[PDB]
């Protein structure tokens, strides 16, 4: 029936800064006449809800996007991953990295 | 303050809601068509007028915008498209009666009932039956009786309604700053943008006459041949000095001459190309037809149809109570939804219909990058031309041979080519004069040049002068023959079916020019020619984004709609007719009548 729970900002005076989230719901004023929180001659709602449906074609379907942004502040590292290790072979002169 | 920059926000706001609203309304209509049942009626209607309930304010809001200084061509075009008020310019008391009269003519024209005087309890309609009475019959009395009954019981009551419809429509046009409603039909075939491509509404009237005088000798020769065949079939009924009647053309109005093909076969020994039995022997189902239609489109360079068309769209066999309409249509619901509604069978006619529907669907997705208001053709004659191009190029015997449907050892000769050419001509070239005559008569009666009393006599005189058809029965002013036609009372433009044909051969010729082929125009195929894939796409990827004058420049050499390839497509037919109708005088005399 159209999933209207996902919203996107359509009108804003200026663009977003990097890694900035804005949840303002002020009635956008495209023209010069101020509006007291209502739509009208040149005032429109910044947020619009999607109408996603399963019959929508490729490119119009809902798409889950996750962005992993790594930060490397001078503090000691905490997010480190794979610790792949070899097998334990003994009784042979070998070099090791315990 | 500025108006140009604040119109973009309004355009985006309108388009965002229009996209999903039109998608939902089209989905409701598609559900109703796919499922003929009550449950899918009201909801569909609940969408339909609702879209109208949304189309008025966006039209109403398009009056505060002074569209006379915006320098953005696309934005100005969108604002002009949104600025047309439609029928909201006249008074409500006249608007309601206009709607009522339109509804009543639509209902009356579709409920024509004529009963035979000897058997007054058997009335028929425009549904097959009365249509079948003369569609396939060899008679002169029953055909004339059906013609007279239809034009007396359906052609009488529509005349008073059309009388006030003409004046009300002209007054609406004047309210829309149109001196006549022919200009309203010619508004789309006009651009006021880039210099050097300018066109005017009055240019069409003179240009159509300019492009109609070069096919008169061929039409006269074909008319003489048809008249001679009628003499060979109907002795002492068609005058060699005169011409053929109206009901003997093959259709009640002479729109198509296909019914007379059997009576005008040049060489009956050579049969027409038929591979339907071969298709049955090869076990070709609807899926095989639909996948074979795809190879032709993909061998030129066009993309493949996306997933969901095979799943969401109905394909074949509605079967039980789950009733669906069998009328082949292509529906672009928006937001990436394209569907087909047709009933497939094992027939070359069905193969051509599938190719036509695929051409329409490809043209529709071609301009998908355009916004909601610009996903339309430049004129009404581009969709049909694109659809008919692929039907034209799939009718070649070479194509059937290469797809494993015709014998590779085939021995096709000039005789069968001429037979197929005449069969095609009886459908294509035999309808241009009638469409011309109907459009010209409608334009000149909307202009008001003639008085009210000079309506039928002038129509019949121009029919004898142009088409070369005499009156089967005398006609007085109380009758109305044009009103007894589908696209005369439903407010449908009839020039749409003319210019498209003028494009088709042109396009085909240009496509043939981009086909690496030598010989006749009919035999050349666009298959196995990738170079023509992008060139045609130049007109496919534009739509309403660019004017038709500019659109007709990336495929054809000249942007003018000059009908060059019509005289060369039927070149073997023309040179055979030159060697056939030597003993029969060509033309017609407008003094002889069947009744006197």
Molecular structure report:
The structure is cut from a larger assembly and holds chains A (98 residues) and B (596 residues). Chain A has 98 residues and is low in regular secondary structure. Chain A has strands at residues 7-9, 28-29, 43-44, 47-49. A two-stranded antiparallel sheet of chain A has the order 1-4. Chain B contains 25 helices and four strands. Chain B has helices spanning 4-34, 39-60, 73-83, 92-109, 130-135, 141-153, 158-175, 181-185, 201-210, 216-233, 276-281, 286-298, 309-312, 348-366, 381-393, 397-402, 414-425, 432-447, 456-467, 486-489, 496-513, 531-540, 548-551, 566-569, 571-578; strands spanning 114-115, 123-124, 329-332, 338-341. In chain B, helix 14 (348-366) crosses helix 15 (381-393) and helix 15 (381-393) crosses helix 21 (496-513). The chains are: A little secondary structure (98), B mainly alpha (596). At the A-B interface, loops of A face helix 1 of B. It is classed as viral protein/hydrolase. The entry lists the keywords SARS-CoV-2, Spike protein. Cryo-EM structure of SARS-CoV-2 S-Gamma variant (P.1) in complex with Angiotensin-converting enzyme 2 (ACE2) ectodomain, two ACE2-bound form. Chain A is Spike glycoprotein.
Shape annotation of chain B: globular
**Which secondary-structure class do the elements of chain A indicate?**
little secondary structure
Number of helices of chain A: 0
Count of β-strands of chain B: 4
Oligomer: part of a larger assembly
The fraction of residues assigned to DSSP E strands of chain A is 5-15%
Straight-line distance between termini of chain A: 59 Å
Largest sheet of chain A: 2 strands, antiparallel
Over all CA atoms, what is the radius of gyration of chain B?
Answer: 25 Å
Counting DSSP E segments of at least 2 residues, the number of strands of chain A comes to 4
| H-E order of chain B | HHHHEEHHHHHHHHHEEHHHHHHHHHHHH
What percent strand of chain B? under 5%
What is the CA-atom radius of gyration of chain A, in angstroms?
Answer: 26 Å
Chain pair sharing the greatest interface:
A-B, 19 and 23 residues
Biggest sheet strand line-up of chain B: 1-2
For the report, how would you describe the main beta sheet of chain B? 2 strands, antiparallel
Tell me roughly what share of residues is in helical segments of chain B. Answer: 40-55%
Number of helices of chain B: 25
- How far the N terminus sits from the C terminus of chain B, by CA atoms, comes to 75 Å
Q: Structural class of the helices, strands and pairings of chain B? A: mainly alpha
Q: Helix content range of the residues of chain A, please? A: under 10%
Disulfide bonds (chain A): 35-43
Region (Immunodominant HLA epitope recognized by the CD8+) (chain A): 3-11
Region (Disordered) (chain A): 10-45, 74-96
Organism (chain A): Severe acute respiratory syndrome coronavirus 2 (2019-nCoV)
